[PDB]
Amino acid sequence: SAVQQKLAALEKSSGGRLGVALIDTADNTQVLYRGDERFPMCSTSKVMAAAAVLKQSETQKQLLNQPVEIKPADLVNYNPIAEKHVNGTMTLAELSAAALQYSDNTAMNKLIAQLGGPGGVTAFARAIGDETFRLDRTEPTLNTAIPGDPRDTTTPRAMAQTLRQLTLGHALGETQRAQLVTWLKGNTTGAASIRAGLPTSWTVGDKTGSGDYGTTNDIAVIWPQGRAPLVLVTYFTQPQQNAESRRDVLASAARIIAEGL
């Protein structure tokens, strides 16, 4: 289709490898570019960690208010929020918010620990029908994004379907589902990614991701005004280890997708 030719041209112009998956919930149609290829998730994996803790809270009603200590040894490379609560506590809700809306890496590590390690995050994925997601490492080493390395990867198709179930489906309880949506809508790191290629009138909740090999990701649920919501995953990685982020590629992909809906 016209869209796949434009996406292929965008990829060729960017010098990297582009993965796209769109789900139109109106007719459940899918648009895929390299949809079944594995890409490094980087911080887009934090959604799965947050969603898993939310699932736990369905049975543990007070879980999200459980205080968790932030010790100096817990701080890794990027901790914009946890840094503000060192030698103090943050609730599991506050840590989930920090992981999603500011991409806090320390917050992500506390979520993984609450789940019993990376295997605990991967288990939730399997529990909701995602046999492609795999989380193998903690922050920051899960961002190495080494070409061919299957660790900490998923496919665009797999992530789109899962993000649909979490945000628009019923993989989570109603209250947990709404909480996840509210967190995604309040993301602060996505202004230059998928949002930048969409009409300003559309409401977007997204989770960005970035790592080595110029890996630049964004996954998003989109609510167009007077229309059915969309799920859009954009994964981009490059051949040079020290390549710079290319969020413009994600915006351009979103724009090419919007041209047609």
What distance separates the 2 farthest-apart alpha carbons in the chain?
55
Q: What is the DSSP string of the chain?
A: -HHHHHHHHHHHHHTSEEEEEEEETTTTEEEEESTTS-EE-GGGGHHHHHHHHHHHHHHSTTGGG-EEEE-GGG--S--TTGGGGTTEEEEHHHHHHHHHHS--HHHHHHHHHHTTSHHHHHHHHHHTT-SS------TTGGG---TT--TTEE-HHHHHHHHHHHHTSSSS-HHHHHHHHHHHHT-SS-TTTGGGGS-TTSEEEEEEEE-STT-EEEEEEEE-TTS--EEEEEEEE-SSTTPPP-HHHHHHHHHHHHTT-
Can you say how many angstroms the Cα of residue 110 is from the centroid of all Cα atoms in its chain?
A: 17
Name the superfamily (CATH) of residues 1-261. Answer: DD-peptidase/beta-lactamase superfamily (3.40.710.10)
179 to each of 51, 97, 173, how far by Cα in Å?
10, 10, 10
Torsion over CA: 122, 86, 101, 176 (sign) = positive
Q: Is 96 a catalytic site residue?
A: no
Domain ranges (residues) in the chain: 1-261
Q: Which two tokens stand for residue 199?
A: 């009409």
Tokens of 59: 């049975």
Active-site annotation holder among 43, 57, 96, 193:
43
| Pairing, β 67-70 against β 88-91 | antiparallel
Q: What CA–CA distance (Å, rounded) separates 78 from 189?
A: 13
